[PDB]
Design an enzyme around this catalytic site. Structure first.
Site, short mmCIF file in Angstrom:
data_model
loop_
_atom_site.label_atom_id
_atom_site.label_comp_id
_atom_site.label_asym_id
_atom_site.label_seq_id
_atom_site.Cartn_x
_atom_site.Cartn_y
_atom_site.Cartn_z
N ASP A 1 2.59 6.05 13.38
CA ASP A 1 3.22 6.72 12.26
C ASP A 1 2.20 7.10 11.19
O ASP A 1 2.16 8.25 10.73
CB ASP A 1 4.31 5.83 11.66
N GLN A 2 1.35 6.15 10.79
CA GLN A 2 0.37 6.44 9.75
C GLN A 2 -0.60 7.53 10.21
O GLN A 2 -1.01 8.38 9.41
CB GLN A 2 -0.37 5.17 9.35
N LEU B 1 6.05 1.34 9.20
CA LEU B 1 5.32 2.37 9.93
C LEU B 1 4.28 1.72 10.83
O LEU B 1 3.52 0.85 10.39
CB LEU B 1 4.64 3.34 8.95
N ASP B 2 4.25 2.15 12.09
CA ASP B 2 3.28 1.65 13.05
C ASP B 2 1.98 2.45 12.95
O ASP B 2 1.86 3.38 12.15
CB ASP B 2 3.86 1.72 14.47
N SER B 3 0.99 2.06 13.76
CA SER B 3 -0.28 2.78 13.76
C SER B 3 -0.07 4.26 14.10
O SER B 3 -0.74 5.13 13.52
CB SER B 3 -1.24 2.14 14.76
#
Lengths: 115, 69, 217, 69, 125, 79
Positions: F41-42, F37-39
RNA sequence: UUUCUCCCAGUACGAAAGGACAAGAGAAAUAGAGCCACC
């Protein structure tokens, strides 16, 4: 203002207008019953060896009282379909064009700067 | 001062005598019905007229500044 | 005693009665809208009703460059550079659509007309629209700005170098040689400074007007 | 990357709330457009550039959705 | 009367895919509300444009005069100027290209503003 | 508050989001490594979790959660 | 004095397609006769 010859400043982001060229953009025809072209009057401008209709938004000719006199002649390009050639206008544009007879909503929408 | 304010220009120089008569245009065919038919007689003095007579659309001086609301 | 220019009648064949009637209306309007005292070179902010807009007023700030007209039809022009565009707007003093008049900076310039400022550098003509009013001294003369503006290349709207214009706020030395001034001075017409046929005196009229204006108050 | 990433979450949350508070416009596109706006700009930025983007959003947040009606 | 809420509801009835409405503060001397509308096809653009004008004329507006329709010739941008609102109707794809919403939403921060360029116009000799 | 109820609901909201692939959507599912998960996504995942439970989660510790059970504990102790 | 737009009216008419009148209003243009409040 803009008339036969009368090298004008192309205030637009259109490719022909935006691209520098050695000859200034002059006018060939004024789309009015009179021969004089003022703010809001369609003209047959010339750009990059091409003929493109332009809409006058400012003139250096003395105007009526209570109005600001521009120090430079400014025009906006308009396509054949009536939509502006350029997607934005940089110079402040008078808001009187809205009340002026004709189709000016498209240009005003493209004109973020209003004085 | 018996001064009438008339729209438009009048031929001649300033201080030049002119002839004034009711409009003869077809639209204003009968305007004398609601005006003094022979003329206005101050001698009768039925009702003293105001010193300055204004048209309804005219903005009198000393009125509030006109706001285009 | 500051008598505003509009009250002073000009020479001519116009009926004096017109001025008397015009002055009364002007005085009546002045009560509704207060006209502040100002001179050419003063920066003013004027509120006026917008016809194109609905129920919206606007304020425009600029240095006063010229005063023209007389009576109820008198007008004043103030200049400013907005978005890099020099703009001059002529405002009629007694127009009903002028909501309010504010003198942001009351001052005078070297010359009674500032048309040469168009030929001057943009900075001399640039003024912040949002600049706040500065304090003024009531029992004093308006500050006189003696700064001499610098001109742009020789091609100008008018030949300011000519003695007839007699512009005292231009840095001619920087852009013009003394020989060029002598060429301009060839149109001196020295008799014009001594000719009494071109003289129109309104001092007596100005003095008489003062009491009449004060009497109406 | 941001001066404070907490503002990003708070700023994004407010934008979504404004979409539910926006009546005249079509609620459908606004939610998608805002999500696209966050993805295109915020993912790669510099501290100085990021400050301008978030600062304009804060004014956008605090000014009735920046004139959107 | 014909007001902002009625028109947008009418726009929804004719299924306007995307509608943008931007209010204008009193300081800015332009229309109080600026409206941008999307339409699937030129035929849909013609239909919706006619519907709003027909409703506007029917819905009182007697004091106001009849409103001319601008841009009908163009198949991608039609704009109608009403008394209190201006609706600019275009295709969905045309919507992103022009980005009218960015211009008004971001008064001076719109990206397309920077895209404008300058030129030089020297004489032949 | 029911800890089990939060866990299933927390898992449910995680499942709702379509972009993330719930190949292994366990209670201990990590974000940076397990789900990649990328920034973005979170951030979005917290938004979905925030909406359901009344938001009021600040990102100061939200990015540190790194798994549904940690936020479950954070949700449990903040209510 | 002449032209154009709007209105009448998307009505009358017509299966539809399409699409008027007359009356009224607003814009200009030119010709003629004038005028200097402003520019």
């Amino acid at each position: 203002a803009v008339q036969k010859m009368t090298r004008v400043r192309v205030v637009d982001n259109s490719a022909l207008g935006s691209t520098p060229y050695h000859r200034p953009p002059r006018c060939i025809h004024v789309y009015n019953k009179s021969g004089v072209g003022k703010v809001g009057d369609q003209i047959l401008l010339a750009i990059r060896g091409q003929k493109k209709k332009a809409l006058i938004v400012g003139h250096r000719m003395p105007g009526s009282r209570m109005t600001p006199k521009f120090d430079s002649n400014n025009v906006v390009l308009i396509e054949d379909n009536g939509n502006p050639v350029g997607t934005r206008i940089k110079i402040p544009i008078p808001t009187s064009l809205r009340r002026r007879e004709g189709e000016y909503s498209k240009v005003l929408a493209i004109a973020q700067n209003f004085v | 001062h018996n001064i009438i304010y008339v729209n438009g220009s009048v031929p001649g120089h300033k201080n030049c005598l002119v002839k004034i008569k009711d409009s003869t245009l077809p639209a204003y065919k009968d305007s004398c019905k609601n005006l003094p038919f022979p003329t206005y007689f101050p001698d009768g003095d039925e009702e003293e007229l105001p010193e300055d007579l204004f048209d309804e659309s005219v903005w009198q001086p000393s009125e509030p500044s006109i706001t285009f609301a | 005693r500051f008598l505003s220019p509009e009250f002073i009648p000009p020479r001519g064949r116009t009926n004096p009665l017109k001025f008397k009637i015009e002055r009364k209306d002007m005085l009546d309007r002045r009560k509704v809208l207060p006209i502040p005292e100002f001179y050419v070179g003063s920066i003013l902010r004027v509120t006026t009703a917008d016809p194109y807009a609905s129920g919206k007023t606007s304020q425009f700030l600029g240095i006063c460059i010229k005063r023209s007209g007389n009576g109820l039809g008198a007008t004043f022009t103030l200049r400013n550079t907005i978005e890099g565009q020099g703009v001059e707007i002529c405002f009629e003093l007694y127009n009903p659509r002028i909501q309010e008049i504010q003198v942001v900076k009351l001052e005078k310039r070297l010359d009674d007309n500032l048309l040469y400022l168009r030929d001057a550098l943009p900075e001399y003509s640039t003024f912040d629209v949002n600049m706040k009013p500065v304090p003024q001294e009531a029992c004093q003369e308006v500050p006189v700005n003696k700064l001499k503006v610098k001109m742009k290349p020789k091609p100008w709207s008018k030949r300011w170098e000519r003695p007839n214009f007699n512009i005292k706020g231009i840095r001619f030395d920087l852009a013009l040689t003394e020989e060029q001034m002598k060429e301009a001075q060839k149109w001196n017409k020295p008799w014009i400074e001594f000719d009494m046929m071109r003289e129109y005196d309104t001092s007596k009229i100005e003095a008489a007007l003062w009491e009449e204006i004060e009497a109406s108050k | 990357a941001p001066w404070s990433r907490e503002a990003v979450l708070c700023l994004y949350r407010a934008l979504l709330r404004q979409g539910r508070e926006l009546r005249y416009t079509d609620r459908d596109f606004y939610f998608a457009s805002i999500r696209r706006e966050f993805r295109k700009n915020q993912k790669l930025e510099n501290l100085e550039a990021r400050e301008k983007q978030l600062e304009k959003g804060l004014v956008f947040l605090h000014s009735k959705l920046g004139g959107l009606i | 009367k014909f007001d902002i809420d009625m028109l947008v509801s009418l726009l929804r009835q004719e299924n306007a895919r995307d509608i943008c409405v931007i209010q204008v503060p009193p300081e800015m001397r332009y229309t109080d509300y600026f409206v941008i509308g999307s339409g699937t096809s030129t035929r849909h653009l013609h239909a919706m444009v006619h519907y709003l004008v027909k409703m506007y004329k029917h819905l009182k507006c007697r004091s106001d005069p009849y409103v001319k329709i601008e841009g009908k010739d163009a198949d991608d941008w039609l704009c109608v100027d009403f008394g209190s609102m201006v609706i600019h109707l275009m295709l969905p794809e045309t919507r992103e290209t022009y980005e009218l919403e960015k211009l008004w939403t971001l008064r001076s921060f719109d990206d397309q503003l920077a895209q404008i360029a300058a030129e030089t116009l020297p004489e032949d000799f | 508050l029911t800890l089990d109820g939060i866990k299933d609901r927390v898992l449910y909201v995680l499942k709702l989001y379509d972009k993330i692939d719930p190949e292994k959507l366990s209670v201990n599912s990590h974000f940076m490594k397990d789900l990649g998960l990328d920034s973005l996504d979170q951030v979005e995942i917290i938004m979905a979790m925030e909406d359901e439970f009344g938001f009021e989660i600040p990102d100061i510790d939200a990015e540190k959660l790194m798994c549904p059970q940690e936020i479950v504990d954070y949700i449990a102790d903040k209510k």
